[PDB]
Design a protein around this nucleic acid. Structure first.
Ligand SMILES: Nc1ncnc2c1ncn2[C@@H]1O[C@H](COP(=O)(O)OP(=O)(O)O)[C@@H](O)[C@H]1O
Lengths: 97, 96, 85, 109, 442, 96, 80, 109, 96
DNA sequence: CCCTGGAGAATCCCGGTGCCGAGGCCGCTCAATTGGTCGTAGACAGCTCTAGCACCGCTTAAACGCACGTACGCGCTGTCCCCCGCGTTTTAACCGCCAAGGGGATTACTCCCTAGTCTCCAGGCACGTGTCAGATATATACATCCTGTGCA
DNA sequence: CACAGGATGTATATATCTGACACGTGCCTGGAGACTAGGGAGTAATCCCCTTGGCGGTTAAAACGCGGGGGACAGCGCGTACGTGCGTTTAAGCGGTGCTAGAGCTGTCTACGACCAATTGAGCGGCCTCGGCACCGGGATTCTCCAGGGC
């Protein structure tokens, strides 16, 4: 009885909304904690400027978006609509990683 | 009085005023433009230096700049930039 | 002796966040196994970049990683970043 | 007496610092000797490229109902143009976003 | 005005509040803004209610008045407003976006109200609406919140256009004269500018006597026998010496040397790797390698064989967790109060501890949690595991138990680790206490 | 009359060609192609033999790598036959 | 000078595909392969001829080809 | 007079020319000044890389039952080692062929 | 008269004889190895020059070479190369 | 039946040729040795401002968990056509040789361009400062999707 | 199967506010004007090599056609895993304390390492020459694939 959208309308709406914006989609403090933890292995007592974590987040988000674009192309090639780890691995293999 | 930092901001602003009179620009956009100018400068200078090295010359000249422009820029942009550079060099060498 | 851990930092990269990144990428349906793979690839990319940046910071004999160091590392990797220097 | 100084940028009619370009070329370790026309040519090329990108950015800002250029407008201008996309293909623009692009198969029908 | 007015309901004002009201009236008539520092437990809210009721009744001058209180006291302030002087009209602003919008559109714009009660966060959110009107009296409770410049609340409260002002606090001086200057500069921007016996003491008393009123809780009740402060020194254990020397000289990340020596004086197990292996037993391991734990383990059973009912104030929730483990090992029932304890859980814990017949022995409190509540009058002994840089904060923790309901004298044991940073900390605290005493107490 | 099934000879040729190391394009046709392409840019162009040989080496390596990626795409799509859409997908993911 | 792309023959494309490791080939892939080779060669030869014109020479050299390939990101070992 | 000339290569115990490396650094437009230890360090690194590649190529050629190393052996050695392959990932070796691999889905059922 | 061309051929031959004593090398492999040495030299020297420019110092030193090697070579290769270079620097300092 | 028999392809073992890698020899140009110089970087010292670490209070958006149903991924079938293996004819590659000339490579000379110095001064930085362009909120009005309903 | 209406998301004006952009001012340091000296390159001329053009014979490779099997593609069913909406929970984000040293930045002094020049002699590149590895051909073996007990 309550109104309900079909499975895929909200997905397209979100696609348009997040292709309209320019914000950062990852959480700032969790990303900073991840960066600090990774830096711990390479060297201890390292300090990060607040701009360094921002630049890292920018580069990471851009890389992930491009990877997802190639992954979607592979999934469409496979006569699918859903992306899968197979698509991610194929994209990485073709791009040379 | 912090130490002086050099940037192409004022020249970008003058080009912006020539192209679009009633328009402005934000700080991050000016940072992006400065980075773009620096990157293009580095590419052109590096290619010109390698051209001079291959030809075994110690001088970088307008010919090297023209060949670097041809090698780096894509096509229509390359030919338009070549025209611009030739115009500027002719004006400079005919005036003073 | 009484303490506990909260959560691994790679799990701070959440499923809704990965889904938002996929929505920007142009993806409609996502499998449930995508999140672990995305975490792995993010970890590898971050490791490479942070290693290069730490190398630059050590060469400068500094103890703080700088935005310029991150930009230099990205340029070495082939991912030039405009807007930070 | 001493004649009035004129900038080489004014001599070439450019809006870019020919003197600063010459200094950067000499201090950049590209060659030991630098010609006189090289800074003029390079300044002209930089000015042309900046003019092109700013033309496109102002066009993209005007039809978004704004008077300021923002990195979103810069990204929209850099993309949607083939030659500039080739030039800046491996370049990430901060706070730029991505183009609106939805594949046809994903469209409902 | 030696007698209580006629608008007061359910009770006549006593001598201290009537003379405080007279002081406030004289201050307003002369045209200065002042600080009321009658200490917690002398009816400051009642004096403020009497002042506002007098302003509304005796002179036909009611208008927009703002009373800034901490969120934890909004209900008590509103209840006192509606119980003592019902003639005045009062509202309170609280809630999320939709509730705040509904309330402002309902009452704040029409302005039938006269006195508004708001919290600091609501003030920051609602600066746009609270700014527009004119305020003839701005009352701020717990004025130590705006003691620091460059703070958003202090900037916003200075930005408002008010005819008069009035501060309510208990400890105007805590660390320096700069905070007292900040309060006085907010009150009188022109009178107090620049920067703040013959060269001291006398000048301070002469300048600040007409701008302040301080009352020690001694001339009102003449009861509540005084405290007894005992300082217990501890020579901490061998593992503590080893870690202390290692930290002083310098593969574990370590940045804040002062805050590493601090916990090192509290308990070495807080560091990673100082604990034994994967047995992770909790029996006599902790007591022996911590001298403060040794002294506590020797002292508490003696109190239990006697009056017991001890309070332990600590500066680290991790230390409180270790103490909870120790209490479980000793089969001691307890109750833990902390910033992480949900507000509903706090009140029932306080009431259970303060119930007439409770088995609870040890109450663990972080010194900076709660505040101006928590009437543990039935408690007997106060034990400070660590001492902070604020002697007044330590004294507030001490006087949480030292309340009007207590009938027997209380003893406060202060633990100090010699030849450590604890010595500096206690020296700084004593110096600040002496400065506050010599400035305000006389 | 003996006749192999359709695909054993393909695997045989795969093995022999992956084991060999010579060029798989006829040199005179490749040279004619190179000269015809070069005529558009500048006329009266002469080539060294080393230049044409290096061009052939690079072209063959590029095509071999492209074909390997195309085969991977065809396998991803649950196929054994390679197709132009596979080639296009490989180029698009590579960045061309 | 025309039609020379057809000199790149179907057996040769098949040999390259076999060295790549493919088993079955569709009939429409030969045209696409010819187009891909054409664009690759056009880029490389454009860069090489530009180097030659800078050198004020009428002969293209293996060094010019190697420099062109290197600046396209496809370094070659074995010719200088 | 002067003592008998002793090479910097023999002083450092290397087989690569420290003097030639120093000259190339000076004439290569890399910096205004070049230190003494930099040629030695670079020569050692170049020698180590050459030794690693040659050892792998010699092992491969001994597998093939030859004495002379050829580009095929060099390609085999480079592509069969992960770190060298990553170093030379975007390099083509002339007349080297490819590593023999056949996808398992193409093998007969 | 004709000019002379420099190469690393004799040094590659010496290293080869040191590693595999009775193993030879052909002309094509020699050209490949010479190109490889030149490419590694170019990469490391360029990285060191960029480091010197970033830190605003006019000299290229052993520290900068070591940092460039860390940036360029992956992992175990980097560690062993750094060890070899440090050993050579110590021997050169001691025996000079 | 899964398991022999042909039949083709790969594999291994010898023997004769060819040319190309390895060694030896000459001259010369580049690297080593010495001596003098100076500017670059190291060492040190003073200062300021971010930054880290342990906590409190509050608000609120975002994350987490859950239940249901629906497109969708995935397996299985059938068909037919398109690709592959094979034989035959045809074509142009390949190799060898010869002949000619354009053009790359070198050398010597000369000048004109660029580097280097000293003044001189104005363009380009930093530092304040105010006003408008974009963000936010809010109430509208409008467009999109979904489902029940006559069609059955 | 169209259609209409309802519920929801989204675009649109309009008013408020604020902090960041654009301007102006003052100072200084880096670019311009004038000049002189030295060597890098432009120019002319010569040499010889390496590219191009052509011709003939051999043969491998390509083009063409044929017949058959297997793989691509469309269709059908299913049952499962993901999207959607709702309710609870958590932690992010913001705003505070509390003293701290720490790290980056700038200014000065001073010594040593890199440059620069002259001299010389010994590695090193080019040129011959020769023998042993790789190549090629040929003959005798193992391996494997495909048809048939539907061998
Ligand atoms: N009506 C009253 N008159 C006098 N003293 C009171 C009254 N109500 C409470 N108190 C005392 O004041 C103490 C707490 O004071 P506080 O709550 O600060 O007063 P107020 O809320 O009026 O400022 C309590 O211990 C109590 O004994």
């Amino acid at each position: 009885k309550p109104h309900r959208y079909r499975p895929g309308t909200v997905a397209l709406r979100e696609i348009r909304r997040y292709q309209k914006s320019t914000e950062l989609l990852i959480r700032k403090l969790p990303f900073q904690r991840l960066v600090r933890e990774i830096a711990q292995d390479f060297k201890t007592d390292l300090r990060f400027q607040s701009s360094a974590v921002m630049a890292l987040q920018e580069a990471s988000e851009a890389y992930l978006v491009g990877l997802f674009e190639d992954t979607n192309l592979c999934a469409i090639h496979a006569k699918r609509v859903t992306i899968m780890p197979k698509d991610i691995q194929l994209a990485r293999r073709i791009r040379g990683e | 009085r912090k130490t002086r930092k050099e940037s192409y901001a004022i020249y970008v602003y003058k080009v912006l005023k020539q192209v679009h009179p009633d328009t402005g620009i934000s700080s991050k956009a000016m940072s992006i433009m400065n980075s773009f100018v620096n990157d293009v400068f580095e590419r052109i200078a590096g290619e010109a230096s390698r051209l001079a090295h291959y030809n075994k010359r110690s001088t970088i000249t307008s010919r090297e700049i023209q060949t670097a422009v041809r090698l780096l820029l894509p096509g229509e942009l390359a030919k338009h930039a070549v025209s611009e550079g030739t115009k500027a060099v002719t004006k400079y060498t005919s005036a003073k | 002796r009484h303490r506990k851990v909260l959560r691994d930092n790679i799990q701070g990269i959440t499923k809704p966040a990965i889904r938002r990144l996929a929505r920007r990428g142009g993806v409609k349906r996502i499998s449930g196994l995508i999140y672990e793979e995305t975490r792995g690839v993010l970890k590898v990319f971050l490791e490479n970049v942070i290693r290069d940046a730490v190398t630059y910071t050590e060469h400068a004999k500094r103890k703080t990683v700088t935005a310029m160091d991150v930009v230099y590392a990205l340029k070495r990797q082939g991912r030039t970043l405009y807007g930070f220097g | 007496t001493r004649a009035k100084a004129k900038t080489r940028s004014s001599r070439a009619g450019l809006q870019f610092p020919v003197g600063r370009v010459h200094r950067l070329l000499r201090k950049g370790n590209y060659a030991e000797r630098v010609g006189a026309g090289a800074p003029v040519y390079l300044a002209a090329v930089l000015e042309y490229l900046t003019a092109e990108i700013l033309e496109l950015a102002g066009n993209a800002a005007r039809d978004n109902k704004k008077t300021r250029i923002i990195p979103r407008h810069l990204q929209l201008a850099v993309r949607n143009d083939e030659e500039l996309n080739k030039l800046l293909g491996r370049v990430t623009i901060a706070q730029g976003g991505v183009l609106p692009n939805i594949q046809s198969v994903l469209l409902p029908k | 005005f030696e007698d209580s007015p006629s608008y007061v309901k359910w009770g006549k004002l006593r001598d201290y509040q009537v003379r405080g009201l007279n002081w406030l009236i004289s201050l307003y008539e002369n045209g200065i803004n002042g600080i009321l520092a009658d200490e917690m437990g002398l009816g400051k809210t009642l004096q403020t209610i009497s002042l506002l009721g007098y302003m509304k009744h005796y002179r036909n001058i009611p208008g927009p008045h703002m009373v800034l209180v901490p969120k934890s006291t909004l209900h008590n302030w509103m209840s006192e407003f509606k119980r003592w002087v019902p003639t005045l009209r009062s509202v309170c602003l609280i809630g999320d976006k939709e509730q705040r919008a509904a309330f402002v559109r309902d009452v704040l714009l029409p302005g039938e109200w006269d006195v508004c009660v708001t919290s600091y966060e609501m003030l920051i959110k609602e600066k746009s609406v609270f700014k527009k009107f004119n305020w003839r009296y701005l009352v701020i409770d717990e004025a130590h919140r705006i003691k620091n410049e460059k703070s958003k609340l202090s900037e916003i409260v200075r930005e408002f256009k008010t005819t008069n002002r009035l501060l309510l606090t208990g400890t105007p001086l805590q660390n320096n004269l700069h905070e007292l200057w900040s309060l006085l500069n907010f009150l009188l921007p022109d009178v107090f500018n620049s920067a703040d016996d013959q060269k001291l003491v006398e000048r301070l008393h002469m300048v600040l006597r007409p701008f302040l009123l301080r009352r020690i809780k001694a001339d009102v009740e003449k009861s509540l026998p005084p405290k007894k402060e005992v300082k217990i020194y501890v020579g901490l254990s061998k593992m503590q010496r080893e870690w202390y020397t290692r930290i002083l000289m310098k593969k574990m990340r370590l940045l804040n040397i002062l805050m590493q020596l601090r916990k090192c004086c509290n308990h070495p197990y807080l560091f990673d790797g100082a604990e034994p292996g994967p047995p992770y037993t909790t029996d006599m391991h902790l007591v022996t390698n911590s001298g403060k734990m040794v002294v506590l383990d020797k002292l508490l059973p003696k109190l239990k064989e006697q009056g017991s009912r001890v309070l332990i104030f600590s500066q680290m929730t991790r230390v409180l967790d270790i103490l909870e483990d120790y209490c479980m090992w000793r089969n001691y029932e307890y109750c833990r109060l902390d910033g992480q304890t949900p507000h509903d859980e706090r009140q029932d814990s306080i009431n259970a501890y303060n119930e007439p017949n409770s088995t609870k022995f040890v109450f663990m409190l972080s010194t900076r949690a709660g505040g101006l509540g928590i009437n543990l009058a039935t408690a007997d002994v106060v034990i400070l595991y660590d001492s902070d840089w604020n002697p007044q904060v330590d004294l507030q923790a001490m006087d949480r138990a030292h309340r009007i309901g207590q009938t027997k004298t209380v003893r406060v044991f202060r633990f100090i680790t010699d030849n450590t940073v604890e010595e500096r900390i206690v020296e700084r605290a004593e110096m600040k206490l002496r400065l506050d005493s010599i400035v305000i107490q006389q």
